[PDB]
Design an enzyme around this catalytic site. Structure first.
Site, mmCIF file in Angstrom:
data_model
loop_
_atom_site.group_PDB
_atom_site.id
_atom_site.type_symbol
_atom_site.label_atom_id
_atom_site.label_comp_id
_atom_site.label_asym_id
_atom_site.label_seq_id
_atom_site.Cartn_x
_atom_site.Cartn_y
_atom_site.Cartn_z
ATOM 1 N N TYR A 122 0.739 -1.241 0.000
ATOM 2 C CA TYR A 122 0.000 0.000 0.000
ATOM 3 C C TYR A 122 0.787 1.322 0.000
ATOM 4 O O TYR A 122 0.491 2.204 -0.790
ATOM 5 C CB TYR A 122 -0.999 -0.006 1.186
ATOM 6 C CG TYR A 122 -2.268 -0.803 0.922
ATOM 7 C CD1 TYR A 122 -2.949 -0.689 -0.298
ATOM 8 C CD2 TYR A 122 -2.792 -1.675 1.884
ATOM 9 C CE1 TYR A 122 -4.108 -1.412 -0.546
ATOM 10 C CE2 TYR A 122 -3.963 -2.409 1.633
ATOM 11 C CZ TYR A 122 -4.612 -2.266 0.418
ATOM 12 O OH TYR A 122 -5.789 -2.910 0.169
ATOM 13 N N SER A 174 -9.505 -8.612 -3.270
ATOM 14 C CA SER A 174 -8.653 -9.138 -2.209
ATOM 15 C C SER A 174 -9.127 -8.741 -0.809
ATOM 16 O O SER A 174 -9.372 -9.620 -0.011
ATOM 17 C CB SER A 174 -7.192 -8.674 -2.412
ATOM 18 O OG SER A 174 -6.540 -9.364 -3.476
ATOM 19 N N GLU A 175 -9.292 -7.450 -0.520
ATOM 20 C CA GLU A 175 -9.736 -7.028 0.827
ATOM 21 C C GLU A 175 -11.234 -7.335 1.161
ATOM 22 O O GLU A 175 -11.608 -7.609 2.309
ATOM 23 C CB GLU A 175 -9.426 -5.522 1.054
ATOM 24 C CG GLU A 175 -7.949 -5.128 0.855
ATOM 25 C CD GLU A 175 -7.067 -5.346 2.110
ATOM 26 O OE1 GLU A 175 -7.371 -6.249 2.902
ATOM 27 O OE2 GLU A 175 -6.073 -4.595 2.295
ATOM 28 N N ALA A 176 -12.077 -7.333 0.139
ATOM 29 C CA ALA A 176 -13.490 -7.596 0.307
ATOM 30 C C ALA A 176 -13.763 -9.059 0.566
ATOM 31 O O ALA A 176 -14.809 -9.374 1.095
ATOM 32 C CB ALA A 176 -14.296 -7.127 -0.929
#
Ligand code: NAG
Ligand code: NAG
Ligand code: NAG
Length: 261
Positions: A122, A174-176
């Site tokens: 990030y 990916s994060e969901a």
């Protein structure tokens, strides 16, 4: 194992929830749970990669390679000028670079290497995208559809467009799958481009911790209070896992036995 494909050109809220459950179903270790929470499997597994194909409104596609052990984006593909174009991050090389490249791009079809000159971390993408944080970088189903056209099949795209493309794709897929909360945010605002609130981000940077707290915490009593954040930026304090369970989709791998139930 199997290529999951999401169509952001012609999608709805009930197409995203399946793809997520598909993601979740496909990424998770059939034998590893935690308070009704699927947990990802450890480095050495039968399968070690996920393929997620994103279809653009423009009908173009862009594929993505996810390590299914952790769900980080190892590399993405796109058919460009009659051949398979593989994009691999610069800190990925050697044999896992081959397995990433040989997977996205069969060693029997025309291929062109277009290296990602940076990593999928990030702060890194944020700096390849011109932001001091990703919350400045909008999210959306039609933001991923548009981003896909600017890139897929393009002989020339910038690093700015790319890492931003990467910010919304690593966040909306990916994060969901790791976070029901994140999937709901995107599902909540399925018609509008949204700035990701503080809880989306906190949960992002706190997966290793949350997965770990939930793991060894008997009866539902996490080992020691957990400091997180609510959507509004205020401090949230979790104590019991049935408290932060809703928001969790998948648990990172934590060696050992946690209350299966
Ligand atoms: C989107 O998918 C629906 C069914 O889910 C289909 O009826 C429709 O034609 C598609 N939209 C297109 C192709 O623009
Ligand atoms: C995790 O890995 C260690 C490494 O030797 C192993 O001995 C152990 O049994 C595994 N499980 C736990 C809870 O540590
Ligand atoms: C899985 O990878 C190889 C198998 O060939 C071996 O090192 C071991 O069985 C596993 N590796 C690790 C680091 O656990």
């Amino acid at each position: 194992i199997n290529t999951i494909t999401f169509d952001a050109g012609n999608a709805t809220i009930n197409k995203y929830a399946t793809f997520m459950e598909s993601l979740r179903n496909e990424a998770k270790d059939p034998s590893l749970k935690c308070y009704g929470i699927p947990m990802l499997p450890n480095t050495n597994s039968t399968i070690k990669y996920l393929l997620v194909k994103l279809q653009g409104a423009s009908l173009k596609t862009i594929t993505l390679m996810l390590r299914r052990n952790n769900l980080y984006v190892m590399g993405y593909s796109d058919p460009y000028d009659n051949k398979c174009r593989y994009h691999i991050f610069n800190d990925i090389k050697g044999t896992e670079y081959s397995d990433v490249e040989n997977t996205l791009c069969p060693s029997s079809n025309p291929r062109v290497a277009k290296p990602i000159n940076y990593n999928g971390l990030y702060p890194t993408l944020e700096k390849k995208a011109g932001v001091t944080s990703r919350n400045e970088v909008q999210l959306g189903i039609q933001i991923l559809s548009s981003d896909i056209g600017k890139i897929s099949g393009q002989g020339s795209f910038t690093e700015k467009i790319e890492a931003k493309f990467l910010l919304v794709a690593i966040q909306m897929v990916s994060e969901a799958a790791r976070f029901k909360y994140i999937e709901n945010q995107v599902k909540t605002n399925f018609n509008r481009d949204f700035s990701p609130n503080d809880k989306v981000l906190d949960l992002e940077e706190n997966w290793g911790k949350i997965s770990t707290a939930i793991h060894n915490s008997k009866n539902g009593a996490l080992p020691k209070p957990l400091e997180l954040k609510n959507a509004d930026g205020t401090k949230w304090i979790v104590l019991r896992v049935d408290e932060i369970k809703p928001d969790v989709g998948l648990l990172n791998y934590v060696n050992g036995t946690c209350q299966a139930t």
